Amino acid sequence: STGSATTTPIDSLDDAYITPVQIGTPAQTLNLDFDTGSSDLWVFSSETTASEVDGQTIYTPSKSTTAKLLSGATWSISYGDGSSSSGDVYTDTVSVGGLTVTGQAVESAKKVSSSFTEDSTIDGLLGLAFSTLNTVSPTQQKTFFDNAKASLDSPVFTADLGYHAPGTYNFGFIDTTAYTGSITYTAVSTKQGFWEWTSTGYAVGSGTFKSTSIDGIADTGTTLLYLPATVVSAYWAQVSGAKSSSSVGGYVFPCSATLPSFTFGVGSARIVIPGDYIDFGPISTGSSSCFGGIQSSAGIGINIFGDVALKAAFVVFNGATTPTLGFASK
Numbered sequence: 001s002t003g004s005a006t007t008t009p010i011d012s013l014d015d016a017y018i019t020p021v022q023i024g025t026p027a028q029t030l031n032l033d034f035d036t037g038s039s040d041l042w043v044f045s046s047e048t049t050a051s052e053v054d055g056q057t058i059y060t061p062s063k064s065t066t067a068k069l070l071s072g073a074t075w076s077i078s079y080g081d082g083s084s085s086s087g088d089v090y091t092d093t094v095s096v097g098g099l100t101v102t103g104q105a106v107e108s109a110k111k112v113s114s115s116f117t118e119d120s121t122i123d124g125l126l127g128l129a130f131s132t133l134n135t136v137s138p139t140q141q142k143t144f145f146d147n148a149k150a151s152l153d154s155p156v157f158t159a160d161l162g163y164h165a166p167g168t169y170n171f172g173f174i175d176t177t178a179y180t181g182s183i184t185y186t187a188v189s190t191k192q193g194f195w196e197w198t199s200t201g202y203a204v205g206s207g208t209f210k211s212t213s214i215d216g217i218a219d220t221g222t223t224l225l226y227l228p229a230t231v232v233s234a235y236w237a238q239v240s241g242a243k244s245s246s247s248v249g250g251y252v253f254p255c256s257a258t259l260p261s262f263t264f265g266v267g268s269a270r271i272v273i274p275g276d277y278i279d280f281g282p283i284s285t286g287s288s289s290c291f292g293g294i295q296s297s298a299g300i301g302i303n304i305f306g307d308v309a310l311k312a313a314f315v316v317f318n319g320a321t322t323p324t325l326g327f328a329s330k
């Protein structure tokens, strides 16, 4: 079987992408943030404390004929930007883009932190890292992708994220119209539960490619590109009004500037980020300064190839028993 769904940016700065997911019978449609940096599918629901809900669309398990309570199972997660939620657990039918899994664990939030209530566009998360990071206890639950692997035509999914535009997640086949050239695959380590890989090096603008190993994660649920301090400082040295701003929390530059492209290595292949994709946008509406899309990972403690990078490429998460990651230009 296969599925394909449209993923849309939630705002004009592509802060995050949402995708329609049908949960329940009859189907309740919620727009979920597909996150390769965690492994919990959880939703706002009729369980969630009332003053912590607004904007969002909730799932109501009592109106789904196929929902079962998973007795005794509770979950609690927190993310890299400090947000968090917890609750209990049902199984129920979940479909993406025509592709249906029965028995999937749908985590019901009893409580959500303040950034989730304030974000009206995102109704939940669908996690697509490896199932060892799942948070349900006592027994951890498999992700949507792990549960669909049995019925998929191949055990892959692809992310094709658009630059101020919609894009596509596909499951189970590779759309050879959606990219150019050939895809290059590189090994993934699953040690930490992420789609973790090693970049072979980087270039700035039309300058030289430096071969140096950058271990990092491919994470659809992080906005920016976060790389080692000395790499990000070589980037912004080429932008004459860029400086590191403590107040703002990163490198800022005048919005009028034309930025250089950034190239990162995959194997022998090279992926080039256009400079326009690194201009994240004005620091406030009508400002002359804009925030940069490449920033340091030093306080994070891991390198993140977030949406700034993955949207310049067509990327294949290859979920075979030995996983790999594929990138092609587009």
Ligand SMILES: CSC[C@H](NC(=O)[C@H](Cc1ccccc1)NC(=O)N1CCOCC1)C(=O)N[C@@H](CC1CCCCC1)[C@@H](O)C(=O)OC(C)C
Pocket: 015, 016, 033, 035, 036, 037, 038, 078, 079, 080, 081, 082, 083, 119, 122, 124, 125, 219, 220, 221, 222, 223, 224, 300, 304
């Ligand atoms: C340095 S890692 C930080 C990362 N968060 C992000 O990257 C959020 C994403 C967001 C977008 C729109 C609205 C709300 C949140 N953006 C963000 O912090 N930005 C700050 C700087 O300007 C760009 C936007 C991350 O924590 N996200 C979670 C996924 C989940 C969180 C809740 C909302 C739905 C997405 C996950 O990807 C994660 O923890 O990765 C870990 C492994 C580092």
